[PDB]
Amino acid sequence: DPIADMISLTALQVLPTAANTEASSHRLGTGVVPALQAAETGASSNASDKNLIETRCVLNHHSTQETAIGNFFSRAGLVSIITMPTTGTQNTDGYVNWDIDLMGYAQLRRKCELFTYMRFDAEFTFVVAKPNGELVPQLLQYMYVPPGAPKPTSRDSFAWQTATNPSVFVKMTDPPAQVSVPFMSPASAYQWFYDGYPTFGEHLQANDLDYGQCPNNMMGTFSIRTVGTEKSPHSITLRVYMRIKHVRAWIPRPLRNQPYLFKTNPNYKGNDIKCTSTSRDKITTL
Amino acid sequence: DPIADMISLTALQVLPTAANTEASSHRLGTGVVPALQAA
Amino acid sequence: SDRVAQLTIGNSTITTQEAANIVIAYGEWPEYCPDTDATAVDKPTRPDVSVNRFFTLDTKSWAKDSKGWYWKFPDVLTEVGVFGQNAQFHYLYRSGFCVHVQCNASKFHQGALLVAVLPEYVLGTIAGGTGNENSHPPYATTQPGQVGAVLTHPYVLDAGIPLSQLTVCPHQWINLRTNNCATIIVPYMNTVPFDSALNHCNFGLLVIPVVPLDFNAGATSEIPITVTIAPMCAEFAGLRQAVKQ
Amino acid sequence: SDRVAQLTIGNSTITTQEAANIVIAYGEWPEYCPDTDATAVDKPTRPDVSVNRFFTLDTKSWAKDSKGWYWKFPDVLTEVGVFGQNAQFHYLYRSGFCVHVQCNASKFHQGALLVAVLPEYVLGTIAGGTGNENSHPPYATTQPGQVGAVLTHPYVLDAGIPLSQLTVCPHQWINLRTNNCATIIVPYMNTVPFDSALNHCNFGLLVIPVVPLDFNAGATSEIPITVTIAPMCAEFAGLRQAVKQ
Amino acid sequence: SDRVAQLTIGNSTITTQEAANIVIAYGEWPEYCPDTDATAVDKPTRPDVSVNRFFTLDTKSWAKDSKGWYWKFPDVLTEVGVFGQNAQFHYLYRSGFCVHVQCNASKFHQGALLVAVLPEYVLGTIAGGTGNENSHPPYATTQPGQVGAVLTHPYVLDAGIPLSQLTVCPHQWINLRTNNCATIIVPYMNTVPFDSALNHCNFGLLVIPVVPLDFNAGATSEIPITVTIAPMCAEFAGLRQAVKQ
Numbered sequence A: 001d002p003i004a005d006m007i008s009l010t011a012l013q014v015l016p017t018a019a020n021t022e023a024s025s026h027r028l029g030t031g032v033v034p035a036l037q038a039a040e041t042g043a044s045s046n047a048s049d050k051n052l053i054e055t056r057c058v059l060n061h062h063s064t065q066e067t068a069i070g071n072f073f074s075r076a077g078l079v080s081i082i083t084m085p086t087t088g089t090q091n092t093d094g095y096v097n098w099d100i101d102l103m104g105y106a107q108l109r110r111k112c113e114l115f116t117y118m119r120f121d122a123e124f125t126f127v128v129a130k131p132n133g134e135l136v137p138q139l140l141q142y143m144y145v146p147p148g149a150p151k152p153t154s155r156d157s158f159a160w161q162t163a164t165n166p167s168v169f170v171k172m173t174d175p176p177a178q179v180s181v182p183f184m185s186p187a188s189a190y191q192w193f194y195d196g197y198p199t200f201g202e203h204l205q206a207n208d209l210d211y212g213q214c215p216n217n218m219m220g221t222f223s224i225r226t227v228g229t230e231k232s233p234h235s236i237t238l239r240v241y242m243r244i245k246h247v248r249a250w251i252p253r254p255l256r257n258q259p260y261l262f263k264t265n266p267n268y269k270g271n272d273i274k275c276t277s278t279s280r281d282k283i284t285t286l
Numbered sequence B: 001d002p003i004a005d006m007i008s009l010t011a012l013q014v015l016p017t018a019a020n021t022e023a024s025s026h027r028l029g030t031g032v033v034p035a036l037q038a039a
Numbered sequence C, D, E: 001s002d003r004v005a006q007l008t009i010g011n012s013t014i015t016t017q018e019a020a021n022i023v024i025a026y027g028e029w030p031e032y033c034p035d036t037d038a039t040a041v042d043k044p045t046r047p048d049v050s051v052n053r054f055f056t057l058d059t060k061s062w063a064k065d066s067k068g069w070y071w072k073f074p075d076v077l078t079e080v081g082v083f084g085q086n087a088q089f090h091y092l093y094r095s096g097f098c099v100h101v102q103c104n105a106s107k108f109h110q111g112a113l114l115v116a117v118l119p120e121y122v123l124g125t126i127a128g129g130t131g132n133e134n135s136h137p138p139y140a141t142t143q144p145g146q147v148g149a150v151l152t153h154p155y156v157l158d159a160g161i162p163l164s165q166l167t168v169c170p171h172q173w174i175n176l177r178t179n180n181c182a183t184i185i186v187p188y189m190n191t192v193p194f195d196s197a198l199n200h201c202n203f204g205l206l207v208i209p210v211v212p213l214d215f216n217a218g219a220t221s222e223i224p225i226t227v228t229i230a231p232m233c234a235e236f237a238g239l240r241q242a243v244k245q
């Protein structure tokens, strides 16, 4: 050989129940000090009940299953309200195009933002009715328009031929429509936070709205209409619910503690910065 | 067992005479310090 | 045997006689991208010692009223040494990092700095104060370069998230009475095996004085904080002409 | 490995990072009374964790001219926690004790406290000064309770005996430049297997500044001395109604 | 385990809690003269404990402008204890030496003393300044006795040789922030197996402040330097009447 120079301390465990407590007695000695720690290392304390007090034995059968990320997320929650009025400002044309973005509602958003990256399949349920909750015999069409596919421009656009895009035809009187959706990102996981820009070039203040936008999260358009060449006399409200399933999450982060202002960024109300915890008068009184 | 929690460094010697003295030489080293104490 | 330490990589060596162990972010060491995860087909270039070495960025001054600072990776080095050059000439890049934040005082000074690594550190604005203006951070704030930037609202990390929970991220404390540095080894984290060193910052480094600096009048008042970092397992692909942004 | 220590008993834990070992009085550990020595026939009650735990009594202030203090056992605890209650409801009592005297200063203060345990600590009076008056110590002086009392003539321990010879008793020194506490484990000592916790004090604890406290003007002047004690192997017999004295 | 040390020889013991190891000059321990090297035929006298013990010479005061001092061996002891007496009554002499230079300050003082052993330390004069006068050092300067002498030109060791190269000789540094003493064990060095303790000094000991003493006004200013030495394996031959020089 002519040139010599050319030649994870963590594993998963199955913990179905909470740790038991072993009985301990008194310890009176030197050299050993379990109560003293050094938080500077970045590690959490390893001290346990038996190190600081005399304990009895407790056979703990308390389950740890409900805190599995799967059971935390697999509960359908509202992610969009699409209205289609008959008279007024909004689309009175009998059709609506909605760009898919699940960051419009707080409850579900705060739960997802607990993690940086998430990969999952989802069950979407479509609850439709009139603005006052009544139901009428109306035929509807829901169509998924992937990025790059022609978006319908009217109630009779050719796009509704849906020869390749997946469509769902259902009556407002039928039960809520429901379908399963796979993990569709071009990347290996969706990311609720993208500290970067989508393209190269200079980033002048005129295009600062690009910051934080990652195409890997842009899944396309969800189009809906009333099936017919004539206008429908009924106002329609579509509530979309998403249920995460077969989920995997990476990198936990601090939970949102300021009200949400916009879908596409973490901006907060600067003049009214809420304190994470409520306050009191003195530090020595409850 | 239903409930688990429910379960002199000095001896006399015969010293009839005073301790003898062993012959010793010079000690020149580190780490070891017999002269230093902690009352 | 835990307070003393030496970090030697490339032609550089760091020493410290008052450390508090070392943190391996998420328990994983940096590593080159394996063939199962890779997608780009060209043979990567792995410069080794010319880019995986320690680089010392500008020093900051810790004052009794400092808010805190932050830097973004790999932005901080995109224009330094042979690392920067490879980052500019190649479209794709990936690597880990060894972060060593330094700060020493005297046995009479006091104060505690929280040094943390927050991946995908997206910043937010105060929305014009009232919250009716959908303003956005300027390029100079999202990617402050080697000089780093100052936090305006450390309590919410300038992003609407509690600083009190930042310890959920790889971190160390530099508590003046205990240690004079912090060391965190960070592996590559992304949803893709390689990425642009220019358009995407994988994580941000935050140094925040949670316990304000304090000392009696007469004691040295210039207490600097220096940041030294070293890329680890730096790989590059998609060669072409140099591009700065 | 000899300067650091932890004492955990009951629901209490004491820590110290500057100890000077621990003393086991007369080389014996406390122990319940065996059947060969016992004389009273009723089954004793051994409360265990509710009475064998650490109790912290009032704190004293070490001044440059303090004479010294003393406490009597088990008098100090006859009215505290579940221990006191058992001592009042039962005629007979016996136990050992873990005494932990605390006192910390700074690397610029100086002074040495002699902490000793003197069994059967009988006090005397100055006999009216001239020596013609056969006066006797008041109940408040012989059994000062939890507050402890002050010595008027530390040199003769208020009992006609030389303080210079007190080291012949189980003891430790709290020399400010060396340690910040003293720990003595005391076994039961008496001519009888059990005795009244009210009418008889088995031993007294003495804390005496043999080397006066001293420090330069400007340094903290409030140097407290705290006493924390824990009964060990406490047994009680001869149950009846509560009696305070 | 390297900072603490005890040197016991004869009826004397030296202790130190802040040492920096010990130096064995040229890697050799002192030893009595073997029969192959010896030339004088009379049986030597080896007094043992009466002469191989520690002797403490006068103390010097380290000032902010001290030049440095030097002593010569065995001259320093030719008139002290039973060693001196043997040196005076015998023509021939040989021995090794354990040199222990002491100097302690506080964690706020600073300064570094170079302690070295220079064999055959021949002194020179300034030659009348101009260099035209072939003057010579007085007996009081070549053999200053127990009091030792002061260097007038430490930079050239009063002998036309650079102090910067003195470390090529057995030596230790007494750097106030690190240690408070220096220890060098010196074997016998000469071109002859035995020699006159009066007419020939085998080596000189030099204590030179390379880094000046410094401290803030208010801190103790009397910083003494003490020299304690012990002959080792002292042998004497050629007995006759006492001779002082």
Ligand SMILES: CCO/N=C/c1ccc(OCC[C@@H](C)CCN2CCN(c3ccncc3)C2=O)cc1
Binding pocket: A100, A101, A102, A103, A122, A124, A142, A143, A144, A166, A167, A168, A179, A181, A190, A191, A192, A193, A217, A218, A219, A222, A263, A264
């Ligand atoms: C036949 C019609 O039925 N199709 C229904 C349907 C429903 C949802 C569809 O895609 C849903 C994509 C979501 C599971 C994930 C959307 N994401 C991914 C991450 N992301 C996001 C948003 C804002 N900032 C960062 C990330 C998103 O909004 C497509 C079709």
Ligand SMILES: [Cl-]
Binding pocket: A156, A160, A161
């Ligand atoms: Cl149609």
